[PDB]
Amino acid sequence: NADEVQVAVAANFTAPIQAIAKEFEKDTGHRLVAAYGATGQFYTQIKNGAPFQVFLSADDSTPAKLEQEGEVVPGSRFTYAIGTLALWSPKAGYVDAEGEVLKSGSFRHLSIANPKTAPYGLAATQAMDKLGLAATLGPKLVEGQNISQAYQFVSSGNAELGFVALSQIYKDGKVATGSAWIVPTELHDPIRQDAVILNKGKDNAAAKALVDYLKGAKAAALIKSYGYEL
Ligand SMILES: [N+]
């Protein structure tokens, strides 16, 4: 069978890439083999020799930092998605339509991803900041090691609500489940998610097919189906 593509995938984009890989494999005959986790954790793994050949980041600074450190194919970095951040519980109406629960709520645990490694976690800390609520919300925070773990804390009842990726609650034009407030962008840095071809993916055929496929129509339609822009 054809060249495989080792892809490091930021946790928010787990479900999206699983769906992309099926059509990608159907369409190119290259196999996408993915690992899922926090962006900063892949920065570490990639610096240490991880076999990954493509890196789908939840930010743009980290693929850019890797390029200025000699780990990236120049000309390879592009934006493949722009995410959105939402406050969310599976309990309906608990997270009101204007996010007033943050200001008046009585919750004890507020799930965010580790903002030192997970950009959807950093967007959460930015928004609390610009919302004027950092000092009051700080003690209630509970950090997952990536945005999938933060979401599971909420989904499992280990916290009353959390800042989750829109990708995890959104399908086909709508939040699908529980209670959400869409964080308005003026509160955090836009979640520009960049891809990059790493040194081990230079002159690999699965890798070029993959970045070209992520810019194609089957890919673009699925990415928009999960609430991402462009
Ligand atoms: N959990």
Numbering used by the authors: 22 to 251
Authors' text:
Molybdenum, which predominantly occurs as the oxyanion molybdate (MoO42−; henceforth MoO), is imported via the high-affinity ATP-binding cassette (ABC) permease, ModABC in P. aeruginosa.
Despite E. coli ModA having a high affinity for MoO, it has been shown to be permissive for binding to tungstate (WO42−; henceforth WO), the oxyanion form of tungsten (W), a group 6 element with similar chemistry to molybdenum. In P. aeruginosa, exposure to WO reduced MoO acquisition, which was attributed to competition between the two metal ions for the ModA SBP and the inappropriate sensing of W by ModE, thereby leading to repression of the modABC operon.
